[PDB]
């Protein structure tokens, strides 16, 4: 109630307080509990092999230098007091670029409790690396992680834990990615060793299943229909040389356009993806359809009966063998 009394209490806490020294300096490690509330995953980029995550990052620890008596309240203080306290040196080890949101003030919370428990909250956007295995792309599953570590303090000085255990990360249901669903998330704690010492580590990880639907409507269905168009050639009279080579050329060349468009939003990886295997298959079909015309063209003067037989067989064999190709492919990858 008395603001001068609280001002006195708070001024007393910070009088002779050394921000250079962690709580219990030289004694047992300070235990830091972590909660995350996920706000969003805004982007996943195959090109940059990274994703963008926005989150409320809460840290709890006890600093007995900040214990207070005679006030049965938790004290929420204006954010700027964070510059007058020790706070943990926590960083995201797989981040590429990160900031604390700044409008209308730095997005940051301090709450003290009578026993000296500090709650410290931050709203962070982080772009984080995600090495992706694109061998089964776009029928791929990715494991995207956020690694949380102490920068300078070893496990002698600091220990990390998920506060609330497996309930410590919330808001996974808020993630609304058009191209992905979150299958699962896991929370891991370990200690990691470098030359400079042993460091506490926490890991959050997600398993991300890519949605097939975009690729059906704008990659697989185009390629199937260009393949079907190539077979129209088998019902055109063999005397229509211009017509049949035109169907052959335009089907062979549209396959290239599918591939170029798809390759435009993907890293320059040195291996074959699942979608590339489909398109190579389709390309072989449309190329062979054009060679079939060259074989017919080559023999129809001398052997008009054999020429007619080859067109009449092609009409059954190319659709059937493309159906088999599709059956083998879609069973292997789904």
């Amino acid at each position: 109630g008395n603001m001068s009394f609280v001002k006195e209490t708070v001024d007393k806490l910070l009088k002779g307080y050394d921000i250079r020294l962690r709580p219990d300096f030289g004694g047992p490690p300070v235990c830091v509990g972590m909660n995350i509330d996920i706000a969003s995953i805004d982007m996943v980029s195959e090109v940059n092999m990274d994703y963008t995550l926005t989150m409320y990052f809460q840290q709890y620890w006890r600093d007995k230098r900040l214990a207070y008596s005679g006030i049965p309240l938790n004290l929420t203080l204006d954010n700027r007091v964070a510059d007058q306290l020790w706070v943990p040196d926590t960083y995201f080890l797989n981040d590429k670029k990160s900031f604390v949101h700044g409008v209308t003030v730095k997005n940051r919370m301090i709450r003290l409790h009578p026993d000296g428990t500090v709650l410290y909250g931050l709203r962070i956007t982080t772009t984080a690396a995600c090495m992706m295995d694109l061998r089964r792309y776009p029928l791929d599953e990715q494991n995207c992680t956020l690694e949380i570590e102490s920068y300078g303090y070893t496990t002698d000085d600091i220990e990390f834990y998920w506060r609330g255990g497996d309930k410590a990360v919330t808001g996974v249901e808020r993630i609304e990615l058009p191209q992905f669903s979150i299958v699962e998330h896991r929370l891991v704690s370990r200690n990691v060793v470098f030359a400079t010492g042993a460091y506490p580590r926490l890991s959050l990880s997600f398993r991300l299943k890519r949605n097939i639907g975009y690729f059906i409507l704008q990659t697989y269905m185009p390629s199937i229909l260009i393949t079907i168009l190539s077979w129209v050639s088998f019902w055109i009279n063999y005397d229509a040389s211009a017509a049949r080579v035109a169907l052959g050329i335009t089907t062979v060349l549209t396959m290239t356009t599918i591939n170029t468009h798809l390759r435009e939003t993907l890293p320059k990886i040195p291996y074959v993806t699942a979608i590339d295997m489909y398109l190579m298959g389709c390309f072989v079909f449309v190329f062979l359809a054009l060679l079939e015309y060259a074989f017919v063209n080559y023999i129809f003067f001398s052997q008009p009966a054999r020429a007619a037989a080859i067109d009449r067989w092609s009409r059954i064999v190319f659709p059937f063998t493309f159906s088999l190709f599709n059956l083998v492919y879609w069973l292997y990858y789904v």
Partner: nanobody
Framework: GSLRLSCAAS????????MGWFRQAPGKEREFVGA????????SYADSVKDRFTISRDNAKNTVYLEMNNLKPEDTAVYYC??????????????????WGQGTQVTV
């Protein structure tokens, strides 16, 4: 005498890009020998085995091999194979590694 230890992996090897060779002598702590990346073949060795042992792999079989040439009576230990995660720390430290093989005893 020349020898070739081998180490065959199976499962989620993409999440564990590094394979490491360790050896434990009777009494002594577990000791780094060398390590190899699955992708690239980027290699490292302890000083003791530098310009004696050679590690490489083949990604087709999912196999790594330690080719132990120019052997010595110091090279007498339970040799173990292990996998390290992408963000799991320095190469040299056995507690950074997660999946440990059985451990072949070698005496000379």
């Amino acid at each position: 005498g020349s020898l070739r230890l081998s180490c065959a992996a199976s499962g989620h090897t993409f999440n564990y890009p590094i394979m490491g060779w360790f050896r434990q002598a009777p009494g002594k702590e577990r000791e780094f020998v060398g390590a190899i990346s699955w992708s690239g073949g980027s290699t490292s060795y302890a000083d003791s085995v530098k310009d004696r042992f050679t590690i490489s792999r083949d990604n087709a079989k999912n196999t790594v091999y330690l080719e132990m040439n120019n052997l010595k009576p110091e090279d007498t230990a339970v040799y173990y194979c292990a996998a390290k995660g992408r963000y799991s720390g320095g190469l040299y430290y056995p507690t950074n590694y997660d999946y440990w093989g059985q451990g072949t005893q070698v005496t000379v």
